[PDB]
Amino acid sequence: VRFLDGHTPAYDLTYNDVFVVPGRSDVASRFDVDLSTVDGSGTTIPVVVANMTAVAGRRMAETVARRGGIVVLPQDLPITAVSETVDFVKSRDLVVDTPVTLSPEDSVSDANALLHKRAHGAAVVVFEGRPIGLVTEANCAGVDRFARVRDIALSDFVTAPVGTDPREVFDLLEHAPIDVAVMTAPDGTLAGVLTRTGAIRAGIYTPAVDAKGRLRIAAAVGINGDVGAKAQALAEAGADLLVIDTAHGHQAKMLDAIKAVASLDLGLPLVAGNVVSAEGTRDLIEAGASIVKVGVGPGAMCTTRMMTGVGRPQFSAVVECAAAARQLGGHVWADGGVRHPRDVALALAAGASNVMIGSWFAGTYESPGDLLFDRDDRPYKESYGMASKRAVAARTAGDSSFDRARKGLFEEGISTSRMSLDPARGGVEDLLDHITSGVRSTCTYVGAANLPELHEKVVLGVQSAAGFA
Amino acid sequence: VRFLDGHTPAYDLTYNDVFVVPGRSDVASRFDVDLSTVDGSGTTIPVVVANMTAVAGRRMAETVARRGGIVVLPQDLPITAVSETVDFVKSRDLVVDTPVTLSPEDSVSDANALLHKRAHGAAVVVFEGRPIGLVTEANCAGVDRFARVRDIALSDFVTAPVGTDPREVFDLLEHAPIDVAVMTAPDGTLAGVLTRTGAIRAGIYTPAVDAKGRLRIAAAVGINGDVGAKAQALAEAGADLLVIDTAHGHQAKMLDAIKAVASLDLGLPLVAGNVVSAEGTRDLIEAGASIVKVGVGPGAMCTTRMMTGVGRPQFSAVVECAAAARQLGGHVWADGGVRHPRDVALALAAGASNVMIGSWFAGTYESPGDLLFDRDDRPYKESYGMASKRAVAARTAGDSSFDRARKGLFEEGISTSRMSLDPARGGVEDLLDHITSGVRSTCTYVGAANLPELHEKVVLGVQSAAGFA
Amino acid sequence: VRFLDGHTPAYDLTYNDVFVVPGRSDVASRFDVDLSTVDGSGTTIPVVVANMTAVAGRRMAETVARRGGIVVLPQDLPITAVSETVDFVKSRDLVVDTPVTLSPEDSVSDANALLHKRAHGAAVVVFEGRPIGLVTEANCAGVDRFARVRDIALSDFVTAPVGTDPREVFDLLEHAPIDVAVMTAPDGTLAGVLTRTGAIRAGIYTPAVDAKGRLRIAAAVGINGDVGAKAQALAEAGADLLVIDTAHGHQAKMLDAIKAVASLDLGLPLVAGNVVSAEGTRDLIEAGASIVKVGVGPGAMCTTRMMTGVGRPQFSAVVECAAAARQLGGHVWADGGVRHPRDVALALAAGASNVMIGSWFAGTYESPGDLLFDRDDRPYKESYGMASKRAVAARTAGDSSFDRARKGLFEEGISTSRMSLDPARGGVEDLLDHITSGVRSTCTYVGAANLPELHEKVVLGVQSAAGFA
Amino acid sequence: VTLSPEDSVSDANALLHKRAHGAAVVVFEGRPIGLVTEANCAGVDRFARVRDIALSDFVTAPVGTDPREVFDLLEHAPIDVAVMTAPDGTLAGVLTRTG
């Protein structure tokens, strides 16, 4: 990377210490920029969903795959659940989104609960595979709490055949009272729904698909036990990417796991981490890892850097890891704390081929967590609220109560960080649009048509802390 | 510019990182300093009003031109409105200010609304061109809400002929109960008003006038469409300065626009921006721009630097751009975030020939926005409250709803930043006095009689962030 | 110590300026790390309790000695009290903890007061040396305020013989309603109690014992009067470590005191302080001090650095003192402000053989201060609440009221800093577990099996203050 | 209050408050399986299918028993509900000490 003249600090840099200097640009608009990655993950956008239990959901996987990203499944899930998730994801359409389907004679409370599980805002009533109506907001107000769904149905939905160009579907929704377009198969069976914003995103974004034309998905494996057996089982399940993660990637056990998994020669790209050093990245790549995960305690006040003195600023670590990996032909992923598009833009400029988003996507409808309201009816979802129970479901490992208590004595309990739902960006697609707009604006300011060009021509500067007063 | 010995930081500097070291001075008082610019804009003060819809008003243009500045009109205004504004501004007197005129039989609510549109605090009643009285504050209290103006009039206004030396006009207002001096033409028709503070400012300040002895004004053009036609239309309308602005000035489209406008050879000075690099300034000047606009995402926590990593500290960017432009014979304008006279003083010391003020002037009476009160009756004006509607009035460009939605998907909505009215500095003239006093004190401390001398003898130092604790 | 390339700041570093870079590690888990010190203090953990009146209690001494640390007694205590404390501490068991014993016919209010003096949560009723029952929480609710203890007793306590392996004691408490295991001597007399967490800590931690197999303890002496007589009296009392402390250790009087104490040749290790300079450490070691105490006004906003400009950042001072002392064969102790395990980890990485904890341990049950509740019933203990009275008990020194007032005129009154009790970490053993977990995680991240190896292979980096925004 | 298996747990919570017994019986093929009581829905998944938090610890007595002995049978019971079934084992009703 290139810095300004004389900008050679005696310290590691964070995302608050750097800025991008505008250069000569010929890019007309944001749409003239290609965001496709070259790391082999197959994503058309540099957004990757972290493998956390409170974020890596099935609906999230479907949505992110359709919008061009990829989601890594948690490593504690059973093989049957992973196989079911992969089969459901790879059976989805590349344009339409799977709507919330309600059978007749169901409870109205169940319908209200299912309404908020997706950003469409309308749940279709289906009988014999045929749509009957859409249940929308305020339909349950004043109605008997024991209503049987087929009492407040609104059979006023716009219908179009599957395969219609979304350009005309957008026009058909110009004067519709509900921004939902239920499209049915030629035999009349339900296939999916569309919306004006969904049609625009379908025309803007490019879905990330495998060689079979199906949505891509990823899965993770732990560092304990027979790693080869789990890797083989996940590869047979249809996973397109394997991620071997841990708190400290630069250890002998992770090297042994990488050697064991790479010996099988499954052909899938391999992701390992996390390291924040050039030596660690080189050691991980030499062991057989194609993608190196970067970022260990990036924050200066995070729990890791308060328990221990171990850590490193994200920007310098990513720069060093990318510089070490590119000469070996590998790629790096930014696995820090991302809460603004500036972080993603700076990570891409540093040389990272992909940026993974963690807890930020937990505050969306598509996240597996259940929606609950605060005292002021603030929509929010409890991060790590039920992940601890799922974590200890596999942590027990059949050990006795004495061993479990001995392990848990030193273990520090992660608190449940409340994350308020953004009313203007409730769906994860809005956050994806925000991040992609930020990255495209960065590319236009720099004057690059694609991410490698952005990394090539980026010019950075250093600023002091006095500007934050 | 000259810095202290050993003050060579490894980072770019903001306005919080620098300070002015006092030197040997022989300037007796603040009044012994000339603030006239040499950039060719014709302003007697380095204050320029930004071309924003919520600030660039007609009354603001008149007031700033009379006080020695200049105002750039928004580029989205129609040619007829711009022509009307120019004709009204160039038909104003160089000393007296245009008062609020109320015709008889009007609504008292309309009179109360018109009272707050200017800082005079008294609205004159005019019939057959002759003043009848002045409606002042608290005149509408307790009176019927449907009063017809000519029921609470106060015919106790001091009258003086037009052309009287303001020195005696100040004495005539020594014991007057209302600090308004209505002056009428020799035929008895109304021409304008004056006040003690207005007389003092008329004796202190020098109006910025063109070759015809009329108040100066500027207009802006967009970067889309036939730039030459708009430039020709504005030049024919009587504009004295053209400003071609955009988010990123260092692009090929802006270079083409500069080449197209300069090919017409209208003779007017040309302003282009924005760039924060020496290469960008050189490219803009070579294309045919006489004045370069500086500043792109100056704040470390601004919306631009949170969406993207693109930006630069204002001080270093202004210094570099001025150093690059002066050797080419051009001039630079500071277009950062100005909220204190320190910012203007440091920008002038850096080498900028003019400093443009944006949202700061929106919280004044003369701003085009309407005055409204908070729950605690706090006077304030909604910045960008109606500018969005005016922005989309020209952004539609006859495109279809599909294209408009596709454009607006990536667009980020600018929030309406409330700006409270300063009770002691409600009028923009008070802010102008504050800024000019700050600049004059800076000049006296440095020991310079004019802005080029201030830039010549200025000595700067660097301070750490520990002083802000 | 080793820093990253180019990380050579022009200033002294605190604990907020440094971070630990992960290296190649082969440590399987936290339990594969040995925390034993090599400074000669005999502690199995680097935790040392400060010699403050509000912290250095008898129960605290017993608990810290059993958990592997050491406690220094205040220097103002009389020789009889110190002898009694040493005799009580050295008469304790290496596994079981001394419970709260209640005799029959006592006041129930006294029982309630004694309940909160230890973290067991159950006070045993003893008659003729035989346990009768355990008084637990909520037993005093609704009961007459003048109850005689033997009216709400619960004779449902699990009993095991002394010497039983805690592995089976843990199993015996699996279904017990009270997590207290009262163990009695073979003659049936009470000897102590145990708990599940206590059994785990007994199996994890190693008690710090002297050559006689008894818990270790330390005492302090003032710098005034005949230091040799006090040192001889404390050595005869059974103290295992002597600490000569003062505000400014690098003074002639402290050198004379060190020479006087070392002339006696008591054979005990000697601790002196405090100094923050290499010259001071060398002077103290040459005078006859085996351990040098480091840290004088470490905070940038502490009372010492606000009264005077005297001070130094803790990290740089500790590094310099350790570097100076190791070549002379001595050792250094970190005596700064410790509130997080990160501070202890960084102090150990800097080269310190032990880290002393001051006011942090005051907010525990085992501290000598009495427990009192806030308006919201917040458990807290008044730091320095009664230490001032004990300080002036020896400060009077038989001087007249005139001399006392003359001394106290310049003296600044230390305020009583309220320290809230942590509900999840009420006992000091929980804080010890937290700190040891932090240190073990640091060691695993670095890749060291013991503290000297941690100091050998540690690699540090420097970060700017912009990361704290 | 009778709850069939595979029903929504929210419906069970709603049905719990419809009577003063405080316990809703789970019935399958006319046979009681358990009683859903208060705080059973706390922390449990909002989409629970009833037959996941059932408590099969209900006291059973034949219909026609003198309530004097039914009161004694409920002296130490943790739930003050006495589910009584018909001689063929089918559910007929419930009783309590106060009842």
In chain D the first and final C-alpha atoms are separated, in Å, by 16
- CB of A350 within 8 Å of a chain B CB? The answer is no
A64 is in an annotated binding site: no
> Distance, in angstroms, between B338 CA and closest chain A CA?
14
Q: Which residue of A has its CA nearest to B223?
A: A28
Alpha carbon D42 to chain centroid, angstroms: 18
Which residues neighbour A446 within 8 Å (Cβ) at sequence distance 6 or greater? Answer: A20, A22, A23, A25, A349, A454, A457, A458, A459, B310
Helix (H) or strand (E) holding C70: strand C70-73
Alpha carbon B83 to chain centroid, angstroms: 19
Question: Are there at least 3 beta-carbon pairs closer than 8 Å between D and B?
Answer: no
Which chains have at least 3 CB atom pairs separated by less than 8 Å from chain B? A
- Nearest CA to C192 out of C92, C314, C50, C318 is that of C92
Does D46 contact A146 at a Cβ distance shorter than 8 Å?
Answer: no
A296 is in an annotated binding site: yes
Per-residue H/E/C for chain B: CEECCCCCCCCECCCCCEEECCCCCCCCCHHHCECCCCCCCCCCCCEEECCCCCCCCHHHHHHHHHCCCEEEECCCCCHHHHHHHHHHHCCCCCCCECCCEECCCCCHHHHHHHHCCCCCCCEEEEECCEEEEEECCCCCCCCCCCCCCCCCCCCCCEEEECCCCHHHHHHHCCCCCCCCEEEECCCCCEEEEECHHHHHHHHHCCCCECCCCCECCEEEECCCCCHHHHHHHHHHHCCCCEEECCCCCCEHHHHHHHHHHHHCCCCCCEEEEEECCHHHHHHHHHHCCCEEEECCCCCCCCHHHHHCCECCCHHHHHHHHHHHHHHCCCEEEECCCCCCHHHHHHHHHHCCCEEEECHHHHCCCCCCCCCEECCCCCEEEECCCCHHHHHHHHHCCCCCHHHHHHHHHHCCCCCCCEEECCCCCCCHHHHHHHHHHHHHHHHHHHCCCEHHHHHHHCEEEECCHHHHC
- The angstrom resolution of this structure is 3.0
> Distance, in angstroms, between A245 CA and closest chain C CA?
15
Q: How far is CA B267 from CA A145, B262, B263, in A?
A: 77, 9, 10
Catalytic residue among C140, C302, C321, C443: C302
| Nearest beta carbon to residue A250 from set C22, C28, C204 | C22
**Solving technique:** cryo-EM
Does A370 contact D11 at a Cβ distance shorter than 8 Å?
Answer: no
Which chains have at least 3 CB atom pairs separated by less than 8 Å from chain C? A
CB-CB neighbors (< 8 A) of B311 in chain A:
19-20
Mutate to test the interface with A, among C440, C463, C468 (most CBs of A within 10 A): C463
The residues pairing with B64 across neighbouring beta strands, listed in sequence order, are: none
Does A107 contact D46 at a Cβ distance shorter than 8 Å?
Answer: no
Q: How far is CA C308 from CA A189, B321, C297, C417, in A?
A: 83, 46, 10, 21
Binding-face residues of A in 296-325 toward C, CB within 8 A: 296-297, 299-301, 305-313
Does D8 contact A145 at a Cβ distance shorter than 8 Å?
Answer: no
Helix (H) or strand (E) holding C89: helix C79-89
3-class DSSP state of C140: coil
- Structure tokens that stand for C122 in this block: 């159950």
Alpha carbon C223 to chain centroid, angstroms: 22
3-class DSSP state of D33: strand
Q: Which residue of A has its CA nearest to C25?
A: A251
| Nearest beta carbon to residue C342 from set A10, A308, A406 | A308
Does A469 contact B465 at a Cβ distance shorter than 8 Å?
Answer: yes
Angle between helices C341-350 and C314-327 (to 10 degrees): 30
Q: Which residue of C has its CA nearest to A278?
A: C23
| Nearest beta carbon to residue A251 from set C26, C204, C346 | C26
Q: Is B302 a catalytic residue?
A: yes
What's the order of all strands across the beta sheet hosting C101-102?
Answer: C101-102, C123-127, C130-135
Per-residue H/E/C for chain A: CEECCCCCCCCECCCCCEEECCCCECCCCHHHCECCCCCCCCCCCCEEECCCCCCCCHHHHHHHHHCCCEEEECCCCCHHHHHHHHHHHCCCCCCCECCCEECCCCCHHHHHHHHCCCCCCCEEEEECCEEEEEECCCCCCCCCCCCCCCCCCCCCCEEEECCCCHHHHHHHCCCCCCCCEEEECCCCCEEEEECHHHHHHHHHCCCCECCCCCECCEEEECCCCCHHHHHHHHHHHCCCCEEECCCCCCEHHHHHHHHHHHHCCCCCCEEEEEECCHHHHHHHHHHCCCEEEECCCCCCCCHHHHHCCECCCHHHHHHHHHHHHHHCCCEEEECCCCCCHHHHHHHHHHCCCEEEECHHHHCCCCCCCCCEECCCCCEEEECCCCHHHHHHHHHCCCCCHHHHHHHHHHCCCCCCCEEECCCCCCCHHHHHHHHHHHHHHHHHHHCCCEHHHHHHHCEEEEECHHHHC
What's the order of all strands across the beta sheet hosting C2-3?
Answer: C2-3, C459-462, C18-20
Binding-face residues of D in 12-51 toward A, CB within 8 A: 14, 45-47
> Distance, in angstroms, between A197 CA and closest chain C CA?
36
φ and ψ at A81, to 5 degrees? -65, -40
Question: Are there at least 3 beta-carbon pairs closer than 8 Å between A and D?
Answer: yes
